[PDB]
Amino acid sequence: AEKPKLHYFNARGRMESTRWLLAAAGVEFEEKFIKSAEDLDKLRNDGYLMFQQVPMVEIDGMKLVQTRAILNYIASKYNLYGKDIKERALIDMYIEGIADLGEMILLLPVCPPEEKDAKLALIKEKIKNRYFPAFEKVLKSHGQDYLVGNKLSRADIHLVELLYYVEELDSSLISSFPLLKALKTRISNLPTVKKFLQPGSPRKPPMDEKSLEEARKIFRF
Amino acid sequence: KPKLHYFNARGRMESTRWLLAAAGVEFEEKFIKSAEDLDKLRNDGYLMFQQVPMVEIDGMKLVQTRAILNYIASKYNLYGKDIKERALIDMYIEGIADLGEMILLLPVCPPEEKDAKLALIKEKIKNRYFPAFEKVLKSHGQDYLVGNKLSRADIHLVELLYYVEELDSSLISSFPLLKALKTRISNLPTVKKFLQPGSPRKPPMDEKSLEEARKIFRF
Numbered sequence: 345a346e347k348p349k350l351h352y353f354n355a356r357g358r359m360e361s362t363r364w365l366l367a368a369a370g371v372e373f374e375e376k377f378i379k380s381a382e383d384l385d386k387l388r389n390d391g392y393l394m395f396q397q398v399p400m401v402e403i404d405g406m407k408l409v410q411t412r413a414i415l416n417y418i419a420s421k422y423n424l425y426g427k428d429i430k431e432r433a434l435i436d437m438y439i440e441g442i443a444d445l446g447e448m449i450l451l452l453p454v455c456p457p458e459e460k461d462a463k464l465a466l467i468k469e470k471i472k473n474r475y476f477p478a479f480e481k482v483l484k485s486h487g488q489d490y491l492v493g494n495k496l497s498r499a500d501i502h503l504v505e506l507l508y509y510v511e512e513l514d515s516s517l518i519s520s521f522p523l524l525k526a527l528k529t530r531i532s533n534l535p536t537v538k539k540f541l542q543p544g545s546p547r548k549p550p551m552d553e554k555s556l557e558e559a560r561k562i563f564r565f
Numbered sequence: 566k567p568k569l570h571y572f573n574a575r576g577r578m579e580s581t582r583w584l585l586a587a588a589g590v591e592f593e594e595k596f597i598k599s600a601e602d603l604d605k606l607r608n609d610g611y612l613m614f615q616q617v618p619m620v621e622i623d624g625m626k627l628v629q630t631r632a633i634l635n636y637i638a639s640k641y642n643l644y645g646k647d648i649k650e651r652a653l654i655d656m657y658i659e660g661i662a663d664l665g666e667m668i669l670l671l672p673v674c675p676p677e678e679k680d681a682k683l684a685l686i687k688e689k690i691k692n693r694y695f696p697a698f699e700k701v702l703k704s705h706g707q708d709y710l711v712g713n714k715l716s717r718a719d720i721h722l723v724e725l726l727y728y729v730e731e732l733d734s735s736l737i738s739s740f741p742l743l744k745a746l747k748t749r750i751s752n753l754p755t756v757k758k759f760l761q762p763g764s765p766r767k768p769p770m771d772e773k774s775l776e777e778a779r780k781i782f783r784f
């Protein structure tokens with residue numbers, strides 16, 4: 345009946361992984377872009393935001409806030425969350441590691457300049473020594489095209505999204521991880537993901553200084 | 566019995582202790598006491614991302630707080646009846662997590678920042694989080710946050726109410742429905758037993774325990 349409506353500002357931020365997941369699922373959606381603090385205050389005043397924050401997604405008659413609530417619902421609805429409780433446990437473990445690394449990268453620009461260089465270095469070492477080894481190992485354990493259940497899940501989508509951001513950081517980091525490289529390609533070639541990667545999709549560019557400034561004005565930080 | 570791998574402290578394992586206890590599930594704990602203990606877990610292949618919490622349950626070695634909790638909640642029927650009830654539960658408990666994270670990390674803030682960050686936490690409790698949960702309870706008038714049945718949401722929220730009480734017992738005072746929930750949940754036989762002295766419930770982290778954390782986790 346009604347397309348999901350995504351409420352956020354015009355940036356990756358905390359809404360991009362939802363854009364990826366919906367697109368991967370073949371689900372069309374609309375976006376309503378917040379451009380100012382007054383836009384956000386209006387959502388607040390209208391009663392639309394349980395904790396007075398965005399992301400918020402209107403879907404199936406609900407007003408869902410909190411990134412993980414949104415993604416868990418969409419993943420379940422479009423059978424991207426595994427086939428039983430144990431596969432969901434594997435998915436969750438994998439994607440919370442992805443979330444942890446993703447949060448580090450997300451927040452980097454918001455670091456004090458005297459700290460940013462150490463923090464980036466630390467992110468690169470965790471990538472090389474902690475996270476990419478863990479995911480490579482999963483893929484090597486079973487030899488399958490997907491992380492869990494030998495079928496596409498949200499885990500594959502969330503990890504490939506992150507591989508795109510790590511490439512932006514440093515395209516060398518993935519070089520010693522052939523299986524991750526192969527996953528990136530395979531997933532990128534799925535027709536829904538290929539369309540999402542093409543120009544003109546809702547996929548968002550890296551956040552530049554001006555966008556970061558808009559964020560500070562809109563969310564008041 | 567599930568086996569919980571963590572240090573002898575609340576930290577990131579306490580919400581799992583609460584949820585297991587609430588569900589009536591007996592568990593065992595293996596306490597890490599040194600960096601060397603953590604290193605053995607890592608070396609033995611027990612930790613996917615070289616971190617704890619880790620829980621051995623039903624043949625899996627599960628890391629990541631949320632993976633552990635989601636598995637336990639589904640297994641013991643504390644995650645609602647369908648994906649829409651799960652959506653409500655998830656939205657509520659991620660709000661709880663956000664607030665919980667601020668309180669958890671308070672002892673680690675630089676000392677020159679701690680005064681400001683406590684005051685911010687009290688402000689958000691008063692003006693953002695407790696209003697939101699009081700609003701949910703008032704909206705339906707039922708004893709439980711979701712589905713008129715006990716769920717993980719009630720348990721995680723009441724755990725947080727105890728920590729907020731530790732911070733400032735006045736913060737809940739204008740929120741009568743949250744007070745009632747706290748009482749009700751605390752009186753359920755499993756939660757009551759967990760709240761009594763000598764249970765696996767952990768105390769507030771003191772300075773000695775925070776020094777142990779730092780040695781163990783090398784920060």
Ligand SMILES: CCCCCCSC[C@H](NC(=O)CC[C@H]([NH3+])C(=O)O)C(=O)NCC(=O)O
Pocket residue numbers: 357358396397398399409410411412450451453454556559563659663
């Ligand atoms: C470099 C900057 C990156 C910008 C990302 C910030 S997202 C906007 C922020 N929303 C949250 O922090 C939501 C956190 C919540 N845990 C979620 O995951 O949905 C907001 O509404 N803030 C308003 C408020 O909290 O009052």
Ligand SMILES: CCCCCCSC[C@H](NC(=O)CC[C@H]([NH3+])C(=O)O)C(=O)NCC(=O)O
Pocket residue numbers: 440444576577615616617618628629630631669670671672673778782
């Ligand atoms: C106020 C004190 C806070 C208590 C310490 C934090 S918990 C121990 C820490 N584990 C994590 O940070 C796990 C985060 C993960 N997202 C989860 O929720 O499980 C660890 O293993 N760290 C070792 C490392 O990462 O190498």
